């Protein structure tokens, strides 16, 4: 179990998938991804430097990218937030995930090795974000394929 | 859920006296009682929504005096 997340002062419960804790209709191998119960209030942390990821889903959703955080605090520990991942590389797919569940969506990410599918199957909404490697390590909106 | 005389004595520890119910302190903490109870045994469900509950009561209190929040978290020890 991941250390930070157990001693979490945000979090509440024992460590679970998010899928156990959030119950939907959830493509294989996504939000299987360990998470608490979050208990405490919203800290309002500052959105990330690296944030780009918030800005496709904003583009897709008409949401702010500070109502997307705001959201995001809501239900997960600020551990799983603000960390040196999401400092130095990042949010991840497991963001995507978990805002995809709190908005009622499901995601194409358009990735450099073809689309992959994030967020609850049981919603009607549906956005597209692409991803790639680059450099940089990069989330868009929209829709990206590539082959031969 | 809680029984009257534990309702009351979480009233009289977090409340003005017995008739301040509309204390968020005292809803937290009767509402801290009953998660605390629920894991006890460990309705998932009946767990998340008093949380969620608790969360956003917090959040009010938060909003409105930060220094009564933080002594109310400390108090019921929400900081594991």
């Known amino acids: 179990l991941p250390a930070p997340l157990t001693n979490d002062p945000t979090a509440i419960g024992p460590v679970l998938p998010f899928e156990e804790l959030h119950p939907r209709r959830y493509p294989e191998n996504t939000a299987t991804f360990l998470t608490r119960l979050r208990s405490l209030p919203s800290n309002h942390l500052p959105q990330p430097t690296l944030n780009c990821l918030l800005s496709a889903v904003s583009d897709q959703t008409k949401v702010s990218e500070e109502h997307l955080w705001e959201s995001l605090q809501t239900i997960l520990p600020d551990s799983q937030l603000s960390n040196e991942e999401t400092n130095t590389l990042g949010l991840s797919t497991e963001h995507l995930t978990a805002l995809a569940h709190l908005y009622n969506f499901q995601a194409t990410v358009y990735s450099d090795r073809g689309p992959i599918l994030f967020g609850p199957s049981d919603t009607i909404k549906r956005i597209d974000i692409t991803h790639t490697t680059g450099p940089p390590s990069h989330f868009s909106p929209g829709k990206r394929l590539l082959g031969s | ?80």
Not at chain 2, 14 to 30: I, P
Not at chain 2, 38 to 48: A, D
Not at chain 2, 69 to 75: D, K, M, S
């Open chain 2, 1 to 80: 859920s809680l029984s009257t005389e534990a309702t009351a004595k979480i009233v009289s520890e977090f409340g003005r006296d017995a008739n301040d119910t509309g204390s968020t302190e005292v809803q937290v903490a009767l509402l801290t009682a009953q998660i605390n109870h629920l894991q006890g045994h460990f309705s998932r469900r009946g767990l998340l929504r008093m949380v969620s509950q608790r969360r956003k009561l917090l959040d009010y209190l938060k909003r409105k005096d930060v220094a009564r929040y933080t002594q109310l978290i400390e108090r019921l020890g929400l900081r594991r």
